[PDB]
Design a protein around this nucleic acid. Structure first.
Length: 142
DNA sequence: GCGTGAGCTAATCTATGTGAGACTGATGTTAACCCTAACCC
């Protein structure tokens, strides 16, 4: 929600001693998402994807940027719990940048060796919740 | 007829450990083939 999301939470995965500040990241991601209750012109639908999912400073890419971070692979799991249930808003017909987010979720599936009921079974509800609300563009999913 | 919130107990769920089944390769053992102390015709 707040534009300062990059400044506040991209700093977290830059410093050493990743043991700790995972709860700080959890507080940041709860604050950015408590604002999701508003429904009058959010104007952040196209903003989040370029910020939380982009290959440059996204958060789903913070699995390829989390592989070496074993201490930040279960903490990453715990923050991405809420980061992946963030999609829980079935009141929009918008489908921007869903094509690449599909394979991003596929990568999230084929990345984590553990938390198999915590990172998976938490992803791939984009399928059957977000996707298959489709067959209007349907370029690559099937 | 039916929503909606609280507490609970059932159901996980991964980390770690242990054993059963399949497998693989180094090894030593038995064995085919031949040579050798020694004598003595």
């Amino acid at each position: 929600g707040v534009r300062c999301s990059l400044l506040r939470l991209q700093e977290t995965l830059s410093a050493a001693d990743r043991c700790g500040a995972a709860l700080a990241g959890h507080q940041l991601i709860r604050g950015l998402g408590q604002e999701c209750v508003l429904s009058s012109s959010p104007a952040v639908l196209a903003l989040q994807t370029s910020l939380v999912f982009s290959r440059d400073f996204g958060l789903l890419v913070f699995v390829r940027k989390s592989l070496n971070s074993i201490e930040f692979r279960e903490c990453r799991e715990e923050i991405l719990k809420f980061l992946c249930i963030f999609l829980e808003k079935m009141g929009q017909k918008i489908a921007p940048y869903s094509v690449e987010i599909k394979n991003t979720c596929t990568s999230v599936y084929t990345k984590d060796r553990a938390a198999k009921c915590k990172i998976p079974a938490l992803d791939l509800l984009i399928k059957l919740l977000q996707t298959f609300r489709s067959s209007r563009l349907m370029d690559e999913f099937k």
